[PDB]
Every structure is written in C-alpha cells, then in structure tokens.
Design a protein around this ligand. Structure first.
Ligand code: HEM
Ligand code: HEM
Ligand code: HEM
Ligand code: HEM
Lengths: 146, 141, 141, 146
C-alpha cells in the first residue's frame, strides 16, 4: 500500500510514541469486548467474563504484543504487505478458520485505540493513512482464503 | 438490541458531548470523507473543504439526530421515521457507509472523550450506532 | 426494522410451511453444513451424516423457534431471550453463521414453496431472518 | 476454484437446464427488491418503484442476461476465475465503485433463483458446489479493490 509522503511521515511519528506494551492489549482486549464472538477463538485464555477481566488478563496483553508486532512488520514493508503476511494468513485462515470480517474489525479497534491514545494528535489525515494500512493488513490476512 | 447497561452508557457518554455536538458531528464526517472518499459521492451539492459551513452545519443535525435517538432509544424506529425515508428510500445509501461513519464517529469520541471511552462504553456505542444504522437503512412504511 | 407489509407477508408464508417446518429446518441445516463447512464446528457433539436424528430433531427446534418469532414478531427480543443467552453468551456464535443459515433457509423455502417466494415475500423473509439473527446474536440482559 | 468431479457433473447439467432469458433478470431483479440500495447503481433503468416494476422492467432482463453471461463464462474457466473477471472488476470496483458485499449478495440471490426454478433438483450438494462457484466469481470480481 502506497501512502502520500505527508501521511507516511506522520504514521511513523505516531507509531514511535506508541507504548509497545499496552496498545496491543487494548486492541485485542476491546475486540473481545465489543465483538463477543471473538472470545470463542481464545478459550485457552482464562477469565474473559467482564470487560475489566478481559483488559486485566495477562494473556490478552501478552498475545497483543505479537499482534502489534505484526503491524509494525507490515508498517515497515508497506510495499508488499501480502508477502510479510503470507504465512499469517495460512495460520488464521486455512487452519484456524477466522472469518475475514474479524480482520477489518481488529484493524479498526486498533484505529480506535490509537485515537484513544493520541487524542487531537490523531488528526483526520493521520487516520486516513492508518486506515489504508490496517485495510491492507486485513486484505493481506485474508489472502489465503480469497 | 440495546441492553439496560447499553442504554444508560450511551446516555452517560453522549451526555458528556453536550455543547460539543456539532463540532464532533463535523469532525466525524470529515474523518469519514478523508478516510473513505467514496462517501463524498453521496454529497455532490456539498462544500467539502476543511472548515466548510455546510459540513459544520450538517454535523449539528447529524449530531442532533443522534441526540434525538438517545432520547427515544427504546423506540428509535418511530423517532427516526422521517430520517429513514430520507436515507433508505430517497438516497438509497449502502449500509456499508453507515459502518464507516459509525467507525469514524467512535474514533472522534475516542479522540475527544478518553475518560468516557471505556471498553464497556465503546461496546455500547457500537451497538447504538449499529441500531440507528439499521433503522435508517430499512424501509418500514 | 419490519414494515406492516413485511410482518404479514412472513405470517402468510410461514403459515404455508405449517406442518412441514421440522423438515425445512432440517434441510436448511444440512444445506448449511454441506455448503459452509466451518459451521459444522459449532456442532461437534452432533451426528452430521444425511438423515441424522440429531439434525432432524434440531431442525424441528430451530423451525419451532422461528415459528415462535412469527407468533411474537412485534416483540422478538422479549420472545427469544433464552435463545440469545444461548447463542450470544454461551455459544458465542459469529453473526456470519446467521447469514449462512438464513440464506440456506431462504433456498429451502424457494425450493419447496415456489408460489410463495414472490420477490416481495423474499424481501420480507430476508429482513425477518436478519432481525431474529440480531436478537440471537445480541446480549440485551 | 476446483470442484470435486461429482459436483462438477451436476453444476454443468443444472446450467444446461437454465432459461438463458429469464433467470438472469430474476437474480438481478431480486437484488434490487431485497437490497433496495442496489437500485442506486441503476438510475438509467427507469421504473423500479414496486417489485412488479423491477421484474417486468426490460432493461433488468436485458442486463440480466449479460450478468448471467458472466457466470456462464466463469463456469467454463473454473481454473482461473480471477483472469476472466480481471476486466469486469475494473469496471465495477475502481470505476463504478460497487462495494464487494454486493457481489456475495448477487451470487446468493442467483442461488435462490436456481432453487426457485429447480425445486427438488437443486439438492444440498448441488447448492454446496454452486456456492463455491458464485463465491469464486465474487472473490474475482472484487480482486481490483482488495
Ligand atoms: C487483524 C489481523 C490480526 C493480526 C495482525 C494477528 C496477528 C497474530 C499474530 C502475530 C499471532 C502470533 C503468531 C503465532 O503465534 O503464530 C496471532 C495468533 C493468533 N491469532 Fe491473530 N491476528 C489477527 C487477527 C486475529 C483474529 C481476528 C483472531 C480471532 C478472533 C485471531 C486469533 C488468533 C489466535 C487464536 C492465535 C493463536 C494463538 C492463541 O490464541 O493461542 N487473530 N495473531
Ligand atoms: C450515524 C448515521 C447517520 C445519521 C444519524 C445521519 C443523519 C442525517 C441527517 C439528520 C440528515 C440531514 C437531512 C436534513 O434534515 O435535511 C442527513 C442527511 C444526509 N445524510 Fe445522513 N446520517 C447518517 C449517515 C449517513 C451516511 C452514512 C451517509 C452516506 C455516506 C449519509 C448521507 C446523507 C446525505 C446524502 C444527506 C442529505 C444531505 C442534505 O440534507 O442536503 N448520512 N443525515
Ligand atoms: C435462524 C437462526 C437460528 C435459530 C432460530 C436457532 C435456534 C436454535 C434453537 C431453538 C436451539 C435449540 C436449543 C435448545 O432449545 O436446547 C439452538 C441451539 C443451537 N444453535 Fe441455533 N439457531 C439459529 C442459528 C444458529 C446458527 C446460525 C448457529 C451456528 C452455526 C447456531 C448454533 C447452535 C448451537 C451450536 C446450538 C446448541 C446445540 C444443541 O442444542 O445441542 N444456531 N439454536
Ligand atoms: C456477481 C457480480 C456481478 C456481475 C457478474 C456483474 C456483471 C456485469 C456485467 C457483465 C456488466 C455489463 C458489461 C459492460 O457493461 O461492460 C455489468 C455492468 C454493470 N453492473 Fe454489474 N455485475 C456484478 C455486480 C454488480 C453489482 C452488485 C451492481 C450494483 C451494485 C452492478 C451494477 C452494474 C452496473 C450499473 C453496470 C453498468 C451498466 C449500466 O450502465 O447499467 N453490478 N455488470
């Protein structure tokens, strides 16, 4: 995915200020809260009953760092997102059976988290760019099911 | 279908918006137009540059339409009745665009009211917005 | 949201199903299991071969539940509440699967009652099934 | 996409028994009644007010044969649905701006119409195969946006 250099410059400066220890856990955590059927793919994760229990759960926070890790990986090779995720799509699709919609949702809860985190800094043009990014990770995470 | 917890979380959160209504409704639409350009096609008669008086005016109505919906939340089809004829019958809006504005509306609120945007209130607001989006998109005359 | 024309079109079409309900609910499930294999995973304790007693018995339950939703159509959340506890909190069913069974259910109806499946009745039924799906997938406790 | 040979025998046989003059305008016609926002992409078709207007509309039956001609084409080159529609997707996606969910929907109303017409003949395994077809047509028609 190709983003115009004014945007590209801004999506790296924002990711730089990212707490590479909490945001990932808020994304996946909010996913399991806002869309309850996502909890079904995380049975081996313990207590998920209350939103506080989903947030405070160590496994949510632990998994969330690797998920965020993939986005950083995809943010660096934004020229070929389909390749870097070619293996991720096999694990999630042809094996784990995650419906393609849940990919756009997590990508969008993540967008909501960056907004929660940055406030006014997460301006409309900085969102617009991140959308192209999270849309791209999704369209690349569903590559081996399409 | 909204829960007793949803109903009040939306009332308590969209309440902290208050006077900030039109400003948010305007930022929401802007965030949508920029992030998703295919939604501009629904507004050809509109002044779409940043700071536009129409967008900022539409934003007050979009935002008041939602406040109206938070008033009669237990009976939204009857309230937004005039609005459904508009978006379902007249405009023929694809429900996907509603998903987009609903998302941008959450992003705006996430950016502005961080103390209100708990996992709980987010969940309740997504459901609320999904509910008005069904009403506006369905033909129930 | 369902129109006064939607509500009656369903009542008169599901009325024509009548005694054939269990059979149709059974065909719909099998169509869904064959057509969309990922749906089988929600039923791991089931006997999933053609002519299963389980799916013939489940189909009666599914069809009867839908018959209950035709009976109490102006108040489906109140009617299907033990069923939402089941599908939303207990089973955590993905709403995509509801689109699937709803599609196979329309196919079944199209296969069996050709004179009832007018574009207008198809419209109303899709809408009706989309509404039971919302309820069953939504947590409103 | 590949169909197991019992299914491939059935799908071609079923399409042989199809009225290449009506089913197409019924599929496209039911798309505009069940999902009335699709009516938007058709201002140059006139009267589409009542379901009777939509079905009896000559442009609907006309355009419908062409849409049916698209499936027919892809049913033959079921080895590379992606290439045959590589042209169709440019028109619908990057130009006509049709949201991909509508491609999943049209292919499902077609499945409903085949069902409507064939009754008992459109059996669960016949549906099971026809789903993979119409989904493949969709995944290929949305290739120029995905
Ligand atoms: C937006 C795209 C997503 C990204 C970037 C992502 C990323 C990741 C990464 C990096 C891993 C760890 C790699 C590994 O251990 O093999 C992973 C594992 C996993 N992901 Fe995702 N994922 C995404 C969406 C989802 C969704 C929507 C679900 C389910 C609702 C899901 C369920 C899982 C599961 C079940 C695992 C295996 C570990 C476990 O839970 O036991 N992922 N994901
Ligand atoms: C959260 C959902 C939405 C709400 C509550 C909402 C509310 C409204 C309201 C109050 C009006 C003003 C019409 C008037 O009084 O003259 C309106 C108009 C309009 N809306 Fe929406 N809307 C929503 C979503 C959308 C979406 C998603 C689109 C399409 C991208 C859209 C397109 C329009 C258009 C084209 C108009 C007419 C503009 C005009 O009045 O000149 N709306 N909407
Ligand atoms: C048209 C929508 C649906 C209706 C009205 C419906 C109705 C029902 C009913 C009446 C039961 C029997 C439960 C009982 O009373 O003991 C049930 C159980 C169940 N349903 Fe559904 N259901 C629907 C959709 C779905 C879908 C689409 C799935 C997922 C593929 C699903 C999965 C299940 C499961 C896994 C159970 C529990 C199985 C069991 O009772 O042993 N349902 N459903
Ligand atoms: C299964 C996916 C679809 C197929 C097989 C299909 C096929 C076709 C074909 C073969 C043409 C005519 C060729 C040409 O004009 O060059 C066409 C044109 C067009 N299609 Fe589609 N289409 C699909 C989905 C859609 C959808 C979902 C819509 C509406 C939202 C749509 C609206 C149109 C329109 C408006 C035209 C232009 C012709 C005109 O001026 O009326 N198509 N389509």
């Amino acid at each position: 995915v190709h983003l115009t250099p004014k945007e590209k410059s801004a999506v790296t400066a924002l990711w730089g200020k990212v707490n590479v220890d909490e945001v990932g856990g808020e994304a996946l955590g909010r996913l399991l809260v806002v869309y309850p059927w996502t909890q079904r793919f995380f049975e081996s994760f313990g207590d998920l009953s209350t939103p506080d229990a989903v947030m405070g759960n160590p496994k949510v926070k632990a998994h969330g760092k690797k998920v965020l890790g993939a986005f950083s990986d995809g943010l660096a090779h934004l020229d070929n997102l389909k390749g870097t995720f070619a293996t991720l799509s096999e694990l999630h699709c042809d094996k784990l059976h995650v419906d393609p919609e849940n990919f756009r949702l997590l990508g969008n809860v993540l967008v909501c988290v960056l907004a929660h985190h940055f406030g006014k800094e997460f301006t409309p043009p900085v969102q617009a760019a991140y959308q192209k990014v999270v849309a791209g990770v999704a369209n690349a995470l569903a590559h081996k099911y399409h | 279908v909204l829960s007793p917890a949803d109903k009040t979380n939306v009332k308590a959160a969209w309440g902290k918006v208050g006077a900030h209504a039109g400003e948010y409704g305007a930022e929401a639409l802007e965030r949508m137009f920029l992030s998703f350009p295919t939604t501009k096609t629904y507004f050809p008669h509109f002044d779409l540059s940043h700071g536009s008086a129409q967008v900022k005016g539409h934003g007050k109505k979009v935002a008041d339409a939602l406040t109206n919906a938070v008033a009669h939340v237990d009976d939204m089809p009857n309230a937004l009745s005039a609005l459904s004829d508009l978006h379902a019958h007249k405009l023929r809006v694809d429900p996907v665009n509603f998903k987009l504005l609903s998302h941008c509306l959450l992003v705006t609120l996430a950016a502005h009211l961080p103390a209100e945007f708990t996992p709980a209130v987010h969940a309740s607001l997504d459901k609320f917005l999904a509910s008005v989006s069904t009403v506006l998109t369905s033909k129930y005359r």
